[PDB]
Amino acid sequence: MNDNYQNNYVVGRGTVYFDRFQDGTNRKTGEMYFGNTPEFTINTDSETLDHYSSDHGMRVMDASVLLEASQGGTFTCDNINADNLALWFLGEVSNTTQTQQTDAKEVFNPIMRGRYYQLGTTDDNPTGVRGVTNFQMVKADASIAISVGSGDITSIVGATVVNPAGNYEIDLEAGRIYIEPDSTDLSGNVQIAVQYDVDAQKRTLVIGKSNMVYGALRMISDNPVGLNKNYYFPKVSIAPDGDYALKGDDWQVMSFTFKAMQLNNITQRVYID
Amino acid sequence: YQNNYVVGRGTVYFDRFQDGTNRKTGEMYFGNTPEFTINTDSETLDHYSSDHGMRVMDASVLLEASQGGTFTCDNINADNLALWFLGEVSNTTQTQQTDAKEVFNPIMRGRYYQLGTTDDNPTGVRGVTNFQMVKADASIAISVGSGDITSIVGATVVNPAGNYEIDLEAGRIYIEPDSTDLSGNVQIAVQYDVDAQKRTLVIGKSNMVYGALRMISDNPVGLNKNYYFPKVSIAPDGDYALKGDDWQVMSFTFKAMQLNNITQRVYIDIVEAAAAVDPTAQRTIEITPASTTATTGGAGVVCTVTVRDGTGTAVQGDAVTFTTVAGATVTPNSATTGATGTATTTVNRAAAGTATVTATLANGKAATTGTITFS
Amino acid sequence: SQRLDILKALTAHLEQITIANGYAYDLKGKVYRGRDRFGADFTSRLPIVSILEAKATDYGSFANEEQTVRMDDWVLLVQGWVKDDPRNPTDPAYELLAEVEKRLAMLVAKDEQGQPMYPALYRLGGKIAKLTLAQPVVRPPEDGLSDTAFFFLPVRVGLKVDIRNP
C-alpha cells in the first residue's frame, strides 16, 4: 500500500533575507540578502505543564498542556559585508566623507619608542583619518603643556623638528606613524606634535551599538533535490551567536540566532509556502 | 553514423586571467603537450529505504563532480615556468654601474661568491668588468665608502693569480681552495663595473593562476573535437626533473570551474570538416647559412632562402627582404626568388662578434634566422 | 588499395625532389619501388631512391573487437644510391639523405605554433597518421666494394586500416 510511496527527499539550498524593522516600529524596510548561508537551522524547545492524578495510580498523567514552544533558529553567513556586520555588532552602517583638512595639528604625550600612533582620532573620526600627506613632526619635552597653536607646528616654543630617517615611519594612506625603537631623537621623557594634510576620503564605518534588531526573516529554497519550500518568519529578533573568527585558515563566518515572534495576535510565527 | 575510432593529437592554449579578475589576456600556446588527460572524480549522496528493505537504495544524486585533468608540456619557456612556479615573468634590465663596490665577510676558500645579489638583482648581476679585489682581516669591520676599496684602512690588494678566478659574465668569484693570501679569517672588498643588460627572470610566487584552457584536436585518425574550459585553475603537478637523460617536461593539473552561473565547466565542440585553404596562396619560407663564420669586414658569407607554397612547390617571383641585428650590411637587402624558389644575399660586418640574419616575405610570413660570427 | 595509394603518394612526393624545386638532387622518375635488385640500367642514372617494405608481418592495434579496424605500423625501407667521392667515400649520401628526410618531414612537420607547415601535404591528405623516421644508416657495403654510396632509412608509416575497405 505504502511500499511504492515516493518520499520527498530534500537537499537543502536557498537564500535567506532579512527585512530590518524601523526602531520601535514593526514597519518593514526591505529584504536584505545575507548572501551565502552554509547553515540555516530552525530550533524549537518546548516545555509541557504535565498534571498527574492524585486519586489513582502513582503518577498517571491526566493533562499535558503546552506552555511555550520557542520557535527560532540559527544561521551562518560567509559573505562578510557591512550590513551583516552591523547586524552582528548590533549596530548601523555609517557612510561618511572625512572633512578635507589642511594643516591639521595633533599632539601625543608622552610617546614610547617602538609604538604606533594613529592620526586623527576624534569623535568625528573615531578610528582615525586616512589619506594623509605633507606630514611633519616636532619634538618637545614631555612636561611642558605643549599645544597646537595656529600657525605652523614648527612655531612652538621649546620644540625641535624631527627628521624621519631612523626616527619614524609613516603609513600615509593609513594615518599610522611608527616611532622607531632605535630613535635617538625621540628618546626619553619626550612628547611630539604633528602637522598633516587630510584628503577628502570617502569613508564608511560600522558602529557597534547595542540595540536589539527585530525583523522579518525569509528563506527561499532552490533545492536541487526535492520540492522547494519557502519559510517566512514575519518577525524575528536577530542576535549574534558564538564567535566571529577574524583570523584563521578557513573562511570567515558570522553566526546568527533568531527567535520567532508573533508580529501581531493575527499573524503566526512562521509560514511555509 | 560511422564509429569514430580516434587517435589523439592537438594543441593546448591557456588564456591567463588578470589577477583577481576573469579578464582574459590571451590564449598562450603551451607547445608540445605529450599528454593531456581529463579526469572526473564524483561522489554521490545515496539514501536508503529504512521502511521496508534491508539497505534498499531509493535515491541517489550527484553531490560533487570534479571535472579537471592534467597535461605535460615538453617546451620549456618562461611563460610555462611562470605558470608552473605559480609566478610571473619579470622582464627587467640591470642598471649600468661603474666602480660598484661590495664586501664579503667571511670568505671561505673553495667557494663561489655572486656579485650584485640584492633586491634589485636577486640572482646577482651579469656582465661584470674591471674587477679588482682587496682582502682585510675578518675581525675588523670595513666600509665601502666613496673612492676606491684600495683606500680602505687595513685592506690589501689581492693578485688574482693563485688567489681567485672570476667569471665575468656570471659575476662569480672562485676563491681558490689552495689560496695563500686568502687563507685564514679574512674578508674581501671588491670593485667592479656592471654592463647594462636586459635580464629576464621568472619570479616564483604563491598565487594560483586562473585562465581559460582550450584544446584543439589534430587527431590524425578520427574526427576532431575541441575542448574548452572557460575557467580553470592550473597548478603544478608532480616533479619537474631539471636533470636527466629524457626531455624535460612540466606536468600541470587543472581544475575546471564555472566562470559564472551561466557558463558551464567544459564545452566540447564537434568540428565538421571545413573547406581547405587554397594551398597555392599559402607560403612557407626557410633560410640556412652557407657557413656560420666569416672574417669581420671581409667578403662575408651567403645564406640561402627557399620559399614554398602549401604543396611544397617552390615559388618563383616572391619578394623577400633581409635584415640583421647589428652592424651587418646585407646586399641585396631585398630579393626576388628565382625559378628554384631560392634567393641568396651576402652579409658582412665590420665589428667582430656574432650576428644573425632573417628574411621576410610580403605578408610578413616569417622571421626565420641563422647565426653568423664575424672575427 | 590503401597501401598502394600511400606508396604512390610517397613516391610522387619524393619525385618532387628536384633542382627546380630547390633541392640539390633530381629524383624525378627515379624514386623506384618494388625492385629488389638495381643493375646498370639504374646505377647508370644515380641518384636513385627505392622504397621497399619490410619483410615483417606485424599485427596492428585493433580499435574494436571483431578485429576489423587497426592502426598499422607499416615499415618502409627507404634507401638510396649516389655516386660517391673516392676520397670521401660516403659524404654524398648524407646530403641526399638530408634532402629526403626534409621532404618526408613536410608530411608531419608542424610550425612552431602547432599548425601544419604544408597543409596539403600534411599526412598525404589524411592517408597516414604518423611518419616515424628512424636514425638513418650511411655505410659502405659490408662485403664488396663500390663507388656507389648507400643510405638506409626505415620509415614507419602509421595508418588506419579497415579491412572492409583496405
Short mmCIF file of all heavy atoms in Angstrom, two decimals, chain A residues 6-43:
data_model
loop_
_atom_site.label_atom_id
_atom_site.label_comp_id
_atom_site.label_asym_id
_atom_site.label_seq_id
_atom_site.Cartn_x
_atom_site.Cartn_y
_atom_site.Cartn_z
N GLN A 6 6.39 7.61 -2.79
CA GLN A 6 7.52 8.41 -3.23
C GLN A 6 7.81 9.48 -2.19
O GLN A 6 7.15 10.52 -2.14
CB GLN A 6 7.23 9.03 -4.59
CG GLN A 6 7.20 8.03 -5.72
CD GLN A 6 8.50 7.28 -5.88
OE1 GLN A 6 8.50 6.07 -6.08
NE2 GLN A 6 9.62 7.99 -5.81
N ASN A 7 8.81 9.22 -1.36
CA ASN A 7 9.20 10.17 -0.34
C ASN A 7 9.90 11.37 -0.98
O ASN A 7 10.64 11.22 -1.96
CB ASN A 7 10.12 9.50 0.67
CG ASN A 7 9.56 8.20 1.18
OD1 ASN A 7 9.51 7.21 0.46
ND2 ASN A 7 9.17 8.18 2.44
N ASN A 8 9.63 12.56 -0.45
CA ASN A 8 10.26 13.78 -0.94
C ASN A 8 11.56 14.02 -0.20
O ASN A 8 11.63 14.76 0.79
CB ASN A 8 9.33 14.97 -0.79
CG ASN A 8 9.96 16.24 -1.24
OD1 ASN A 8 10.49 16.34 -2.34
ND2 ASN A 8 9.91 17.23 -0.38
N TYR A 9 12.61 13.38 -0.68
CA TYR A 9 13.93 13.61 -0.12
C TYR A 9 14.48 14.93 -0.61
O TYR A 9 14.45 15.22 -1.81
CB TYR A 9 14.86 12.47 -0.50
CG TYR A 9 14.36 11.12 -0.08
CD1 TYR A 9 14.46 10.03 -0.91
CD2 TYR A 9 13.80 10.93 1.17
CE1 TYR A 9 14.01 8.81 -0.52
CE2 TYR A 9 13.35 9.71 1.56
CZ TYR A 9 13.46 8.65 0.71
OH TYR A 9 13.01 7.41 1.08
N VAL A 10 14.97 15.74 0.32
CA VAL A 10 15.34 17.12 0.06
C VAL A 10 16.80 17.32 0.43
O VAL A 10 17.27 16.84 1.46
CB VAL A 10 14.45 18.08 0.86
CG1 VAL A 10 15.02 19.44 0.90
CG2 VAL A 10 13.11 18.14 0.26
N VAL A 11 17.52 18.03 -0.43
CA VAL A 11 18.85 18.54 -0.15
C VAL A 11 18.75 20.05 -0.05
O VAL A 11 18.51 20.73 -1.05
CB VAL A 11 19.87 18.12 -1.21
CG1 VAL A 11 21.15 18.82 -0.99
CG2 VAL A 11 20.10 16.67 -1.15
N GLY A 12 18.96 20.58 1.15
CA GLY A 12 18.62 21.96 1.42
C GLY A 12 19.57 22.94 0.78
O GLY A 12 20.78 22.90 1.03
N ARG A 13 19.03 23.82 -0.05
CA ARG A 13 19.73 25.00 -0.53
C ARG A 13 18.73 26.14 -0.60
O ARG A 13 17.53 25.91 -0.75
CB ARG A 13 20.36 24.78 -1.89
CG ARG A 13 21.37 23.68 -1.97
CD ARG A 13 22.61 23.98 -1.21
NE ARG A 13 23.60 22.94 -1.42
CZ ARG A 13 23.74 21.87 -0.65
NH1 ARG A 13 22.95 21.69 0.39
NH2 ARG A 13 24.67 20.98 -0.93
N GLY A 14 19.22 27.36 -0.50
CA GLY A 14 18.34 28.50 -0.62
C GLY A 14 18.96 29.77 -0.08
O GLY A 14 20.03 29.77 0.52
N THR A 15 18.24 30.86 -0.31
CA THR A 15 18.67 32.21 0.01
C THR A 15 17.88 32.72 1.20
O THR A 15 16.67 32.51 1.29
CB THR A 15 18.46 33.14 -1.17
OG1 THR A 15 17.08 33.16 -1.53
CG2 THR A 15 19.23 32.68 -2.36
N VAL A 16 18.56 33.40 2.11
CA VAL A 16 17.95 33.97 3.29
C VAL A 16 17.91 35.49 3.16
O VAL A 16 18.87 36.10 2.68
CB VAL A 16 18.70 33.54 4.56
CG1 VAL A 16 17.99 33.98 5.78
CG2 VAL A 16 18.84 32.06 4.59
N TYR A 17 16.81 36.09 3.58
CA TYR A 17 16.60 37.53 3.51
C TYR A 17 16.08 38.04 4.84
O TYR A 17 15.24 37.39 5.47
CB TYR A 17 15.60 37.89 2.41
CG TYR A 17 15.83 37.22 1.09
CD1 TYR A 17 15.36 35.95 0.85
CD2 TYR A 17 16.50 37.87 0.09
CE1 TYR A 17 15.57 35.36 -0.35
CE2 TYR A 17 16.71 37.27 -1.10
CZ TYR A 17 16.24 36.02 -1.32
OH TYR A 17 16.46 35.43 -2.54
N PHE A 18 16.56 39.20 5.25
CA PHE A 18 16.17 39.83 6.50
C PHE A 18 15.66 41.24 6.23
O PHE A 18 16.39 42.07 5.67
CB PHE A 18 17.34 39.87 7.47
CG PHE A 18 17.00 40.44 8.79
CD1 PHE A 18 16.28 39.71 9.69
CD2 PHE A 18 17.41 41.70 9.15
CE1 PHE A 18 15.97 40.21 10.90
CE2 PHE A 18 17.09 42.20 10.37
CZ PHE A 18 16.38 41.45 11.24
N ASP A 19 14.43 41.51 6.65
CA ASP A 19 13.79 42.82 6.50
C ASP A 19 13.85 43.54 7.84
O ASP A 19 13.00 43.36 8.71
CB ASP A 19 12.36 42.68 6.02
CG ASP A 19 11.77 43.98 5.56
OD1 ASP A 19 12.25 45.05 6.00
OD2 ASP A 19 10.83 43.94 4.74
N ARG A 20 14.87 44.38 8.01
CA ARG A 20 15.06 45.07 9.27
C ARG A 20 13.94 46.06 9.51
O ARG A 20 13.61 46.88 8.64
CB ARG A 20 16.41 45.77 9.28
CG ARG A 20 16.80 46.34 10.62
CD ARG A 20 18.24 46.74 10.63
NE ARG A 20 18.65 47.27 11.93
CZ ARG A 20 19.91 47.36 12.33
NH1 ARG A 20 20.90 46.95 11.56
NH2 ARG A 20 20.19 47.85 13.53
N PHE A 21 13.34 45.98 10.68
CA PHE A 21 12.30 46.90 11.10
C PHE A 21 12.89 48.23 11.52
O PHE A 21 14.03 48.31 11.97
CB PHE A 21 11.51 46.33 12.27
CG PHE A 21 10.57 45.23 11.91
CD1 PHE A 21 9.83 44.61 12.88
CD2 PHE A 21 10.42 44.80 10.61
CE1 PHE A 21 8.97 43.61 12.57
CE2 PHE A 21 9.55 43.80 10.31
CZ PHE A 21 8.83 43.21 11.28
N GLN A 22 12.09 49.27 11.38
CA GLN A 22 12.46 50.57 11.91
C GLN A 22 12.31 50.58 13.43
O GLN A 22 11.40 49.97 13.99
CB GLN A 22 11.61 51.66 11.28
CG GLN A 22 11.76 51.72 9.80
CD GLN A 22 11.08 52.90 9.17
OE1 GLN A 22 10.09 53.40 9.69
NE2 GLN A 22 11.62 53.36 8.06
N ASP A 23 13.21 51.30 14.09
CA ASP A 23 13.31 51.25 15.54
C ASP A 23 11.96 51.52 16.19
O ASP A 23 11.22 52.42 15.78
CB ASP A 23 14.34 52.27 16.01
CG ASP A 23 15.67 52.11 15.32
OD1 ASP A 23 15.73 52.36 14.09
OD2 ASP A 23 16.66 51.73 15.98
N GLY A 24 11.65 50.73 17.21
CA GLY A 24 10.40 50.86 17.94
C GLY A 24 9.17 50.61 17.09
O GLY A 24 8.05 50.85 17.54
N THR A 25 9.36 50.11 15.88
CA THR A 25 8.29 50.01 14.90
C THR A 25 8.35 48.67 14.19
O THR A 25 9.44 48.14 13.95
CB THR A 25 8.39 51.15 13.89
OG1 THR A 25 8.52 52.39 14.59
CG2 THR A 25 7.16 51.20 13.00
N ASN A 26 7.19 48.12 13.87
CA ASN A 26 7.10 46.90 13.07
C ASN A 26 6.99 47.19 11.58
O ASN A 26 6.44 46.39 10.82
CB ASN A 26 5.93 46.04 13.53
CG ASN A 26 6.12 45.48 14.92
OD1 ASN A 26 7.18 44.94 15.24
ND2 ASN A 26 5.09 45.55 15.74
N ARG A 27 7.51 48.33 11.15
CA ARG A 27 7.41 48.76 9.76
C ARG A 27 8.64 48.32 9.00
O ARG A 27 9.77 48.69 9.34
CB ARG A 27 7.24 50.28 9.67
CG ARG A 27 5.80 50.76 9.71
CD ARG A 27 5.75 52.26 9.62
NE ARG A 27 6.48 52.72 8.45
CZ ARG A 27 7.23 53.81 8.41
NH1 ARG A 27 7.35 54.60 9.48
NH2 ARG A 27 7.86 54.12 7.29
N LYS A 28 8.42 47.52 7.96
CA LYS A 28 9.50 46.92 7.20
C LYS A 28 10.27 47.96 6.40
O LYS A 28 9.80 49.07 6.14
CB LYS A 28 8.93 45.85 6.27
CG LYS A 28 8.59 44.56 6.97
CD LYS A 28 8.08 43.49 6.03
CE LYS A 28 6.62 43.67 5.70
NZ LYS A 28 5.74 43.16 6.77
N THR A 29 11.48 47.59 6.03
CA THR A 29 12.38 48.44 5.27
C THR A 29 12.89 47.81 3.98
O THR A 29 13.20 48.54 3.04
CB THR A 29 13.59 48.82 6.12
OG1 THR A 29 13.15 49.32 7.38
CG2 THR A 29 14.43 49.86 5.44
N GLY A 30 12.98 46.49 3.91
CA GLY A 30 13.47 45.82 2.73
C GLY A 30 14.25 44.56 3.03
O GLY A 30 15.06 44.53 3.96
N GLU A 31 14.01 43.53 2.24
CA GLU A 31 14.57 42.21 2.50
C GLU A 31 16.03 42.19 2.08
O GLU A 31 16.36 42.09 0.90
CB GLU A 31 13.77 41.15 1.75
CG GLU A 31 12.45 40.78 2.37
CD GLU A 31 11.63 39.84 1.50
OE1 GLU A 31 12.14 39.39 0.45
OE2 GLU A 31 10.48 39.56 1.87
N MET A 32 16.91 42.30 3.07
CA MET A 32 18.35 42.30 2.83
C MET A 32 18.86 40.89 2.60
O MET A 32 18.69 40.02 3.46
CB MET A 32 19.04 42.95 4.01
CG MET A 32 20.50 43.17 3.85
SD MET A 32 21.29 43.54 5.41
CE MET A 32 21.40 41.90 6.06
N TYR A 33 19.47 40.66 1.46
CA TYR A 33 20.05 39.37 1.15
C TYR A 33 21.37 39.20 1.88
O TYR A 33 22.32 39.97 1.66
CB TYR A 33 20.24 39.23 -0.35
CG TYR A 33 20.84 37.94 -0.81
CD1 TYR A 33 20.47 36.75 -0.24
CD2 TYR A 33 21.76 37.91 -1.83
CE1 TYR A 33 21.01 35.57 -0.67
CE2 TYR A 33 22.30 36.75 -2.26
CZ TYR A 33 21.93 35.58 -1.68
OH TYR A 33 22.48 34.40 -2.12
N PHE A 34 21.44 38.20 2.75
CA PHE A 34 22.65 37.97 3.53
C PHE A 34 23.79 37.51 2.65
O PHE A 34 24.96 37.80 2.94
CB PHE A 34 22.38 36.92 4.59
CG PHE A 34 21.76 37.46 5.83
CD1 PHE A 34 20.49 37.11 6.17
CD2 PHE A 34 22.47 38.26 6.69
CE1 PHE A 34 19.93 37.58 7.30
CE2 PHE A 34 21.90 38.73 7.82
CZ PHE A 34 20.63 38.39 8.13
N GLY A 35 23.49 36.80 1.59
CA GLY A 35 24.49 36.10 0.83
C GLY A 35 24.53 34.64 1.22
O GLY A 35 23.59 34.08 1.78
N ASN A 36 25.66 34.01 0.90
CA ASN A 36 25.78 32.59 1.13
C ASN A 36 25.55 32.28 2.60
O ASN A 36 26.15 32.91 3.48
CB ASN A 36 27.15 32.10 0.71
CG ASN A 36 27.27 30.62 0.74
OD1 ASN A 36 26.37 29.89 0.33
ND2 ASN A 36 28.38 30.14 1.25
N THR A 37 24.66 31.33 2.85
CA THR A 37 24.38 30.85 4.20
C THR A 37 24.63 29.35 4.20
O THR A 37 23.78 28.57 3.77
CB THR A 37 22.95 31.16 4.63
OG1 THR A 37 22.06 30.86 3.56
CG2 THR A 37 22.82 32.59 5.00
N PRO A 38 25.81 28.92 4.65
CA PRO A 38 26.10 27.49 4.69
C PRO A 38 25.14 26.72 5.57
O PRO A 38 24.94 25.52 5.36
CB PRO A 38 27.51 27.46 5.26
CG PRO A 38 28.07 28.77 4.97
CD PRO A 38 26.96 29.72 5.07
N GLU A 39 24.57 27.39 6.55
CA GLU A 39 23.77 26.78 7.59
C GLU A 39 22.53 27.62 7.84
O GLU A 39 22.61 28.84 7.96
CB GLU A 39 24.58 26.65 8.86
CG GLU A 39 23.81 26.17 10.05
CD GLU A 39 24.69 25.98 11.27
OE1 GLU A 39 25.92 26.18 11.14
OE2 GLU A 39 24.16 25.66 12.35
N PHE A 40 21.39 26.95 7.92
CA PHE A 40 20.15 27.58 8.35
C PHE A 40 19.31 26.52 9.04
O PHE A 40 18.80 25.61 8.39
CB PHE A 40 19.40 28.18 7.17
CG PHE A 40 18.18 28.92 7.56
CD1 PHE A 40 18.25 30.26 7.87
CD2 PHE A 40 16.97 28.29 7.67
CE1 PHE A 40 17.16 30.93 8.24
CE2 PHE A 40 15.87 28.98 8.04
CZ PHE A 40 15.97 30.30 8.34
N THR A 41 19.18 26.64 10.35
CA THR A 41 18.52 25.65 11.17
C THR A 41 17.41 26.31 11.97
O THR A 41 17.52 27.46 12.38
CB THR A 41 19.48 24.97 12.13
OG1 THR A 41 20.10 25.95 12.96
CG2 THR A 41 20.52 24.22 11.37
N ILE A 42 16.34 25.56 12.17
CA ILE A 42 15.20 26.01 12.94
C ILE A 42 15.10 25.15 14.19
O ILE A 42 15.02 23.92 14.10
CB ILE A 42 13.91 25.94 12.11
CG1 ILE A 42 14.11 26.71 10.82
CG2 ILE A 42 12.78 26.54 12.84
CD1 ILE A 42 13.12 26.39 9.81
N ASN A 43 15.13 25.79 15.34
CA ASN A 43 15.07 25.12 16.63
C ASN A 43 13.76 25.43 17.32
O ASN A 43 13.18 26.51 17.15
CB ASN A 43 16.23 25.56 17.50
CG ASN A 43 17.57 25.23 16.90
OD1 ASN A 43 17.68 24.32 16.08
ND2 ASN A 43 18.59 25.96 17.31
#
